[PDB]
């Protein structure tokens, strides 16, 4: 029964890690490149030369 209890402790640690990692992936997979698309183009950076 002791070993069993240790098993639930392991699994609860696992699911907390799952939640944390899912949140992190949502954040970075969503915000960054979606805003980065607004990056200008080389010629207008050259000033419409």
């Amino acid at each position: 029964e002791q070993a069993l209890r240790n098993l639930e402790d392991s699994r609860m640690s696992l699911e907390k890690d799952i939640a944390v990692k899912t949140n992190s992936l949502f954040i970075d997979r969503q915000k960054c490149m979606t805003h980065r698309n607004r990056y200008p183009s080389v010629l207008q950076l050259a000033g419409y030369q």
């Binding site: 490149m33 698309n37 607004r38 990056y39």
Partner: protein, 50 residues
């Protein structure tokens, strides 16, 4: 407009593989014989022991 941005994004992919391909042009210069191949065997020889 986001669709115009994604076709800008994939163009940003194209230029980078062109940046890569010139790297692979110089990789071929190195790949006269390469060195990451050495790194790969380390894991392969590592698991072989296992």
């Amino acid at each position: 407009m986001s669709k115009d941005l994604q076709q800008e994004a994939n163009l940003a992919k194209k230029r980078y593989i062109d940046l890569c391909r010139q790297g692979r042009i110089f990789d071929a210069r190195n790949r006269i014989i390469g060195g990451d191949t050495q790194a790969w065997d380390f894991q392969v020889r590592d698991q072989k022991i296992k």
